[PDB]
Design a protein around this ligand. Structure first.
Ligand code: MTX
Length: 158
């Protein structure tokens, strides 16, 4: 199982219909993992996806799967090839070390707020996909879709 982070980042790692569409393309038909506040932000289960919500305060919405921990979350995702972790801030940080792939939307915007996507060391990651877009009528800012994979373990010894 590949564990993947997916997130939209403004300038300075701070956390557009095209991003949402990108989000959907990349999560549809997969298990999606999220914290409770993110689930509340969406306002609903995501159709066509196995919704796993991690929380110590499991809600009454039986349409989604409620997990108490990362381990139980990954267990519900079973033998999936790829599990999508979609926020929020704390959850990204809690999954980072296990993640081997990241889908990142780099939004060209400078916005305040003190909630950041985790510090990751760029050297430890490589880009396998990248796609820039200009701002248009529907999308207020330029933005860049990117997929990063964790560089494999260095196996060489002198
Ligand atoms: C607030 N929230 C969290 C959210 C928003 N944008 C993101 N964008 C990216 N790149 N990554 C995320 N993790 C992400 N998360 C939301 C809110 C709405 C929907 C939503 O209604 N998505 C529909 C898309 C609706 C449509 O495009 O027609 C879907 O089917 O996935 C998703 C996430």
């Amino acid at each position: 199982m590949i564990i993947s982070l997916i997130a939209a980042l403004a300038a300075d790692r701070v956390i557009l219909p095209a991003d949402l569409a990108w989000f959907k393309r990349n999560t549809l038909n997969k298990p999606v993992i999220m914290g409770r506040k993110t689930f509340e932000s969406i306002g609903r289960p995501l159709p066509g996806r196995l919704n796993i919500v991690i929380s110590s305060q499991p809600g009454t919405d039986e349409r989604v799967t409620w997990a108490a921990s990362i381990e139980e979350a990954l267990a519900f995702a079973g033998n999936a090839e790829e599990v999508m972790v979609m926020g929020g801030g704390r959850v990204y940080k809690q999954f980072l070390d296990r993640a081997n792939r990241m889908y990142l939307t780099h939004i060209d915007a400078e916005v305040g707020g003190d909630t950041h996507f985790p510090d990751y060391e760029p050297d430890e990651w490589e880009s396998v996909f990248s796609e820039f877009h200009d701002a248009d009528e529907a999308n207020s800012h330029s933005y860049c879709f990117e997929i990063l994979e964790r560089r494999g373990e260095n196996l060489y010894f002198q």
